Every structure is written in C-alpha cells, then in structure tokens.
From a paper:
The histone chaperone [name] plays an important role in facilitating nucleosome assembly and disassembly during transcription. [name] is a heterodimeric complex consisting of [name] and SSRP1. [name] consists of an NTD followed by an SSRP1 dimerization domain, MD and C-terminal domain. The N-terminal domain of [name] resembles an inactive aminopeptidase.
Here, the crystal structure of the N-terminal domain (NTD) of human [name] is reported at a resolution of 1.84 Å. Our human [name] NTD construct consists of residues 1–510. While the construct contains residues 1–510, electron density for residues 433–510 was not visible. The structure of human [name] NTD reveals two lobes: an N-lobe comprising residues 1–175 and a C-lobe comprising residues 176–432. The structure adopts an aminopeptidase-like fold similar to those of the Saccharomyces cerevisiae and Schizosaccharomyces pombe [name] NTDs. Despite the presence of a linker between the two lobes, the orientation of the two lobes appears to be rigid across the three [name] NTD structures. Isothermal titration calorimetry analyses show that human [name] NTD binds histones H3/H4 with low-micromolar affinity, suggesting that [name] NTD may contribute to histone binding in the [name] complex. An ITC experiment with human [name] NTD against H2A/H2B showed very little change in enthalpy when [name] NTD was added to H2A/H2B, suggesting that [name] NTD does not bind H2A/H2B or binds with a very weak affinity. Surface-residue conservation and electrostatic analysis reveal a conserved acidic patch that may be involved in histone binding.
Author numbering: 2 to 432
C-alpha cells in the first residue's frame, strides 16, 4: 500500500485554509474551492493536479475535491478513497487541527454518481455564502466523469472565481523535503548537460557533422532513460520538463514554449535549454555554447553573466519582483543601453511542481514579494545580435541565453542549485 505523507498534508491544507480565510485578492469572495481532475493521458501542467501533488504526494485522476468552510469532501474511485483514508481517519493526529474533517465519497463505475454529486453541491451551497466557487480556470480535463460532474455543477449557477494566482503564491514557498527534490532535479539536469549534452555537441563540432536540432533534442530525451546519468534515481521518477530546446544559426526564440526545429545545427552561438522533473518537481538550465566567439561576442556574453549575478544579489526575501526586474534593467540602461531592446522581456519565473508559474514571472509589472524558500528559474538573454565578422546569413545573427535554478535564501544573494560552469573557458569551443 502506498503511504500518504500525513504530516505534509496537514501542514499544507492548513496553509491553504489560512490564506483563504485571510481573504486577500482572489480569495476574498470565495465561498468554496472546487478542484476536479479528469483523464490525464499527457500528465499536463495544471493547478488542479499540482494541488493534488502538493497535498497528497500524488496526482489522482477522475477525482473531485471540494474545500468548504467547515468540511472537505474528496470523491474518487474505491482504491483512491482507500488511499485517502490515511488522512481522513485522523487517529488523534496532533497536526490535524487547522482544516476541516474529510468526507470521502466513492466514484461508482457501473452506477449513477448523482447522489454523490448532489452531496457536494449541497456542501457548496452551505459553505459561507454559498454563491461563488474558487476554481482553476485554465483546467479542463477530458473524460466521462468530468462531463457528468460539470453537467451537474453547471445547473447551479455558481459564480466562478479564478484562484490560480493566489494559490500559486500559497504553495510557492518550498518545504525542506520539496527543496531536496528540486535540488535532485537540478543535479540530474546538470549531470545530463555536463556528461552527455556538452560532450555530444563537441563531438558533432569536432567531426563537422550535420545534426538537426530536433534529433539532438531526441538524444537528450533518450539520455535520461539511461541510469548512468541519474545518480541512483529510479528512471521512472525522471522526466523532461519540456522537450529540450536547441537553437542556432540565426534562428532563435528565447522561451520555453517552443520545440527544437528541424534545421541542422550551426557552429555558432548554440542555445541549449533543458530541465529535469524529478518526482514531479521541476528544475531548469540554459547554456549557450559558442564556437570561436569573437571579442565582441564574449563581451556581450560576460555582460549577460554580470546581469544574472546582479539579479541573484537582488532576489532576496521581502523584495517585490518588479523591483528586482528594474534593478537589472537599470544596469543595462547605464552600462549597455544599446542592449535595452535586445534583452528578454522576462528574467525568470517561479518554479515548482508546475514548471513555469505565470503569476510569478520576473517582469516590470509583478507586485508579488519574494519569500525565503521560493525557487525560480532565473533566465536572461540577448536576441537579434549582429556578428560583424559574419559572412553567410546563418553567421550574421546570434543570440545569448543563460538560465539557472535558484533558491531565495534566508539572507543575502539567491543560491544556485544547478551546477554547470558557464565561463567562456567552459562553454567556448575553439577550433
């Protein structure tokens, strides 16, 4: 039988209730929080399943959770219900005080679930003002169970309030156990880059091979099925956060939402983005490899490194994210104003069970304050740079992209969890 970490459940559900009751921003008018997971074949990033992973240690498909002021209802298959009895039966657990008692309902396979749906709907109507439900608006899972539930729920005319941003902030600070998972993810990412990827690229360059970016990305995906790069980790606990992104030869997009294209790799500036997800917890790395970079290319690259460390020095508990952003852009404006229009609009983002927290992005508008124990992907780049010495079109335009997994510390500059050496000595390839 799979053990549920009960103490972690009670700590975290208490954090959720504390913030909900505090009633700031999107929490203010919410009468009940309603979270439902359908079929998930692709294991997509979603607040609904991230919340499950946070509370229970595991995603639970075809499962509904209703958080009310004085009760909590979980509805799932008999086997998942049996699993949840570990926290539903409290057995005098001291930690159980900060949240309501749990009622478990069984999802029937061969029978109508109307009776259970009605119980949850009545619980919502009875919770606080019984009018508005907190939801994750982006999440729509397929399958018959979600169809049936949504049909039932939609008849009731509850107002839906998106709570994605406030929940992101609620779960952002990592417990030590979670940080250990993210540290392991970061170390696996670093080992795959150091031992496999960088070597592979140097082989390709030394042999003057023509390799499509897409094919190189596939090779990296295959590499993490090999135990030699996992340092003891069960291979089934390791996944890519996203398909590895390799770009070169004047075609760059510096973001994590695009895949590697089919062009042959140019021995240029080669941007390489990859991250490992270990036991559902994400990490991220970006390195640019440079073949015979000129003095001017090196100058821009070293300035990029300078900006990153300036960012880490500013990313400290209590500081507003936008103020970190402005501090870094101030350095660009002062020292290299010509790069103001070349630099990435975002400098990084909060990272966790979900890879990229859209409300935690480091940009000019973000008002959220940093807290000790939050983890970020800190990413900075320059795009659309011109190489003067370039002749062919693939040589003329280059980009520079750097990123690391970092931890907001107790005091002082943020701590870097990834370990891949980034000096020109390390990422330069000289023919």
């Amino acid at each position: 039988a799979v053990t549920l970490d009960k103490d972690a459940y009670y700590r975290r559900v208490k954090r959720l209730y504390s913030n909900w009751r505090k009633g700031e921003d999107e929490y203010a008018n919410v009468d009940a929080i309603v979270v439902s997971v359908g079929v998930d074949e692709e294991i997509v990033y979603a607040k609904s399943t991230a919340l499950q992973t946070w509370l229970f240690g595991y995603e639970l498909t075809d499962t509904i959770m209703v958080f009310c002021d004085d009760k909590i209802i979980f509805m799932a298959s008999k086997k998942k219900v049996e699993f949840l009895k570990q926290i539903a039966n409290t057995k005098g657990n001291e930690n159980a005080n900060g949240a309501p008692a749990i009622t478990l309902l069984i999802r029937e396979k061969n029978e109508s679930n109307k009776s259970s749906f009605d119980k949850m709907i009545e619980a919502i109507k009875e919770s606080k003002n019984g009018k508005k439900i907190g939801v994750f608006s982006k999440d729509k899972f397929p399958g018959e169970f979600m169809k049936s539930w949504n049909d039932c729920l939609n008849k009731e005319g509850f107002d839906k309030i998106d709570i994605s941003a406030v929940v992101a902030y609620t779960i952002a600070v990592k417990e030590d156990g979670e940080l250990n998972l993210m540290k392991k993810a970061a170390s696996i990412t670093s080992e795959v880059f150091n031992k496999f990827f960088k070597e592979r690229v140097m082989e390709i360059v030394d042999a003057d091979e023509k390799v499509r970016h897409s094919k190189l990305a596939e090779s990296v995906e295959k590499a993490i099925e090999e135990k030699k790069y996992l340092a003891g980790a069960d291979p089934s606990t390791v996944e890519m956060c996203y398909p590895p992104i390799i770009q070169s030869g004047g075609n760059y997009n510096l973001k994590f939402s695009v895949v590697s294209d089919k062009n042959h790799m140019h021995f240029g500036a080669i941007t390489c983005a990859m991250g490992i997800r270990f036991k559902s917890y994400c990490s991220n790395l970006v390195r640019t490899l440079m073949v015979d970079p000129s003095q001017e290319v090196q100058e821009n690259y070293n300035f990029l490194l300078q900006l990153q460390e300036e960012l880490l020095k500013e990313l400290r508990h209590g500081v507003k994210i936008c103020d970190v952003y402005n501090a870094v852009m101030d350095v660009v404006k002062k020292q290299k104003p010509e790069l103001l229009n070349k630099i990435t609009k975002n400098l990084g983002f909060g990272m966790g069970i979900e890879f990229r927290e859209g409300s935690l992005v480091i940009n000019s508008k973000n008002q959220y304050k940093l807290k000790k124990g939050m983890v970020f992907s800190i990413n900075l780049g320059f795009s659309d740079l011109t190489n003067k010495e370039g002749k062919k079109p693939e040589e003329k335009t280059y980009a520079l992209f750097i990123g690391d997994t970092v931890l907001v510390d107790e005091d002082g500059p943020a701590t870097v969890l990834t370990s891949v050496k980034k000096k020109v000595k390390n990422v330069g390839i000289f023919l």
